[PDB]
Structure formats: C-alpha cells, structure tokens
Scaffold this active site. Structure first.
Site, PDB file in Angstrom:
ATOM      1  N   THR A  83     -18.353 -10.967  -4.402  1.00 32.53           N
ATOM      2  CA  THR A  83     -19.496 -11.048  -3.494  1.00 32.53           C
ATOM      3  C   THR A  83     -19.359 -12.259  -2.588  1.00 32.53           C
ATOM      4  O   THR A  83     -19.093 -13.363  -3.071  1.00 32.53           O
ATOM      5  CB  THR A  83     -20.828 -11.151  -4.248  1.00 32.53           C
ATOM      6  OG1 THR A  83     -21.814 -11.751  -3.383  1.00 32.53           O
ATOM      7  CG2 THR A  83     -20.690 -11.998  -5.503  1.00 32.53           C
ATOM      8  N   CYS A 197     -19.397  -8.878   3.930  1.00 25.94           N
ATOM      9  CA  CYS A 197     -20.151  -8.347   2.805  1.00 25.94           C
ATOM     10  C   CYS A 197     -19.269  -7.307   2.138  1.00 25.94           C
ATOM     11  O   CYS A 197     -18.775  -6.397   2.811  1.00 25.94           O
ATOM     12  CB  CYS A 197     -21.479  -7.733   3.259  1.00 25.94           C
ATOM     13  SG  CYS A 197     -22.213  -6.556   2.102  1.00 25.94           S
TER      14      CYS A 197
HETATM   15  N1  LIG Z   1     -21.928  -8.062  -2.266  1.00 28.82           N
HETATM   16  C1  LIG Z   1     -22.444  -8.372  -0.937  1.00 28.82           C
HETATM   17  C2  LIG Z   1     -23.970  -8.515  -0.979  1.00 28.82           C
HETATM   18  C3  LIG Z   1     -24.430  -9.648  -1.872  1.00 28.82           C
HETATM   19  O1  LIG Z   1     -23.678 -10.042  -2.792  1.00 28.82           O
HETATM   20  O2  LIG Z   1     -25.551 -10.148  -1.651  1.00 28.82           O
HETATM   21  C4  LIG Z   1     -21.790  -9.630  -0.365  1.00 28.82           C
HETATM   22  O3  LIG Z   1     -20.568  -9.799  -0.486  1.00 28.82           O
HETATM   23  O4  LIG Z   1     -22.444 -10.489   0.243  1.00 28.82           O
END
Ligand SMILES: N[C@@H](CC(=O)O)C(=O)O
Ligand SMILES: N[C@@H](CC(=O)O)C(=O)O
EC number: 5.1.1.13
Lengths: 232, 231
Positions: A83, A197
């Site tokens: 993430t 994201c």
């Molecule tokens: N997985 C997504 C959304 C999140 O983690 O909030 C990101 O890389 O930001």
C-alpha cells in the site's frame, strides 16, 4: 531464497497482484514448479481506512508494526507493505522491526530513475497525492518531481479508489475518467504517471494511459523478488 | 472474527481463489470495507511436488506441520490447507497443531450431502483419485461414493494439473478434454462432479460441465468464512 513478509489487505484486491507477481517472478528465475516463500499478514482494512480518515496515524503504525513483528517471528526475512498510503507510517515499522524494509517509494524511484525521468504525474489517494511523505522522499532521494491533479479531480480519484476499486468494482466510466486525468497531466509536461495507489493498475491497463505507466504494485513486487534472490 | 491461517502455494495459483473468496465472504457479511484477517504461509511448491512423486510423504507432513505451528504462534486460530492431495498428511498437522483444522473433505462432504447426492465423479491428482485417504473419508463420514476416470484418462488429467494448470496455462484442448471425461462419468450415473484438485476450477467453467460442480476450493473457502465468524 529468502522468505518475504507481506503486510496486505489494504485493500486485499491489490494484495493479489503482489502475490501473483512475486510467484511469477520466482518461477521466471528458478523455473519448473518453484514458487515464492511468502508469509502474508492480511489486515481488516476497515480499521486501517477508518484511522486514515480520523488521522489516527499512530494507531495504524502500531497495527502494522505488530503485524511485521509477528511475521518476523514466523520466519520472514524482509518486510513488504502492500500500500502506498500506509508508507506514511513506514518509520514506525522500520523502527520497531529489525527486518529489512523494502520501501515502495524507493522501488518506484529507481524505476523512474531508470527511465531517465524527473517530472511525472502522480495518482493515488488524496493522502499520497497531497501530503509530503511520499512526494518528499521521491524529491530528496531521486530528484523526482510529481504533478498531481486539480482539487476536484483529486476528490473523485480518491472517491473511486475507496468506493469502487477497494470493493472490486471496475467501471469503464471510472476507467475513462482516469485516462482523461492522465491526459491532462500529459499536457503539463509529465513524462510518466505513477499509479501511486496499488489498486489503480486493476482499473487502468497501460494502453489506456497516454503516458508511460509506473505501476507501484508491479514495481514493488519485482523489488521483492530481487531481494528474495539477492539480485538486482 | 477469528484470524484464519492458510497453508498455500500448492500451487499458488489455487491459493489466490482462497484469498479472494474468503475476503469476499467477510465483506458480504460485515459490509463496508471490512476484510478478512488472514495469515498465509505459502511454501515453495517444487519441494512438495517432488516429495509426492518420490513418496516422501512424512517429509511434507513435517513441512506443513511446522508451517501450521508458525502460523498459530503468529496468531492463527484455525488451519486451512489449500490443497486436496496434501490432506494425505493432514494427520501430521492435526496431531502436532492444537488449532482447529478445517478438513477439505469434510467441507466437500457436507456440500454433496446438502445436494442429496451419494454417487459423484471425482477429478483430481492421481493420488487423490486412486488412493484411499480422500475417498475413504467421504465413504466413512458421509456414505458418498466416488467414480473415477479410466487409467489413461487419469494419467492425462494428472498430466494437465502439474504441467499446465500449476504453471498458469489454461488451454482449450485441456478444458475440452476435462469436459469429455465429465460427460463420460455422467454416463455411469455420476450425480455431480467433485473438482478434487484446487486448480481444476481455474480451467473448467461450470457451463462446460454437464454435471453439477463441487469446486473444492470454493467450498473450502466458504467453510473458512463460516468458521472465522462462528456461523
Ligand atoms: N492500497 C491503496 C489504498 C490505501 O492503502 O489506502 C494505496 O496504495 O494507497
Ligand atoms: N493443488 C492440487 C494439486 C496438489 O496440491 O497436489 C490439489 O488440490 O490436489
């Protein structure tokens, strides 16, 4: 090979490409039926995402540090956080867990560096686009500058990530909107676009982006593979 | 919810449906952005699959039991083994790990039981189809009898599993071949077909099977969801 420790579930939809590409990377290098040695801690994203909107970043740092420490005890030899947004609290994980921490923004910055680019578009959550934790590391460590969409565009980009992408809904309306935003940043001189994201790659194929695509999840997974085999 | 512990990567391609379906089941049940609490140990399948061919079953029992114990100590509250064949050594895991072990054959037997069926086709590895460890449990615990393909068919079915399915290769020739075997066992009065290899559903959509399909991976994932929140 080293056993990699994954902090996933954020969302689980984007944890899957990590798992797939890390296994495909091991197969490519080792051949045959070889697959990756993986320990994955998938969290309940509800608690994490709730803290995001409340600004309870210290609490998410606890959650992820505890998760990393549990994978360490299970035999993980490096930590991969699946993430971009939660690298806002990467310091907590790197400080409380002695395992090597493969920072997503370093793998992304090396990829952009390799393509010879210093001015790129950045899509992600509102946190990743607007704050300093991600963009500031790209600036200080790689001299890479990011262009982000306008305020109204950021709100809709963010809404799609949380109201559609993280729930497994990939609509052409949202796909075409992302392509439209990319095309506008291209006219500001962006040389490439960071899919900053981990779910955006699930929505936007590379042939829908008028500009060369840096998919953070793919890049991070390849960095994981190189660590597991002591390569690159 | 109870955190589930998955023993996966046998192969990793069938581990993904488990992770997807467990998460989707939690989301359906808790709503919103709720996601499943999962600890997964994915092994290098090469060592496991070679052991199968060499008959080194005890060695895989150690590998899997040690993996289960590591997950328990990381917070696992129940164990799910993401492979039909390796339930040949489920006794090793259940004997050495005190966590509840959600046996794949129990989950499948209750599904076939729910359908009112007692005579089904069984597709799987050669080991699962030919040996006693899987079919004997269905017989003893559920009075379900399995029909299996002829010898030449079993060799090619197993062939496709390890040389194509486990490598992410899904060909129409293989898909059609599986479909012909299913239509053939239907002639013997098979009431449904057990996809008794966790990768078969990646190859064969339900609309290519003339028999009702019991997808082991899906059924196993649904049982895991029921366990995690005590349904
Ligand atoms: N997985 C997504 C959304 C999140 O983690 O909030 C990101 O890389 O930001
Ligand atoms: N995953 C396949 C193949 C194997 O693990 O041997 C099965 O369910 O049997």
């Amino acid at each position: 090979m080293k056993t990699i420790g994954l902090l996933g579930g954020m969302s689980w939809e984007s944890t899957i490409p990590y798992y797939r590409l890390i296994n495909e990377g091991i197969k490519q290098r080792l051949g045959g039926l070889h697959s990756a040695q993986v320990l994955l801690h998938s969290v309940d994203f509800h608690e994490i995402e709730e803290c995001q909107r409340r600004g309870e970043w210290d609490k998410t740092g606890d959650i992820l540090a505890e998760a990393a420490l549990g994978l360490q005890r299970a035999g993980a030899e490096g930590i991969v956080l699946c993430t971009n947004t939660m690298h806002k609290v990467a310091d907590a994980i790197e400080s409380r867990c002695t395992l090597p921490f493969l920072h997503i923004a370093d793998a992304t910055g090396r990829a952009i560096t390799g393509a010879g680019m210093t001015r790129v578009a950045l899509l992600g959550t509102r946190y990743t686009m607007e704050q300093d934790f991600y963009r500031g590391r790209l600036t200080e460590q790689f001299s890479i500058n990011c262009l982000i969409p306008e305020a109204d565009e950021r709100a809709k980009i963010n809404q799609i990530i949380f109201e559609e992408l993280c729930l497994g809904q990939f609509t052409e309306a949202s796909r075409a909107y992302y392509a439209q935003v990319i095309a506008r940043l291209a006219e500001q001189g962006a040389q490439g676009v960071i899919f900053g994201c981990t779910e955006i790659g699930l929505l936007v194929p590379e042939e829908r982006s008028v500009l060369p695509v840096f998919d953070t999840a793919a890049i991070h997974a390849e960095d994981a593979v190189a660590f597991m085999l002591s390569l690159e």
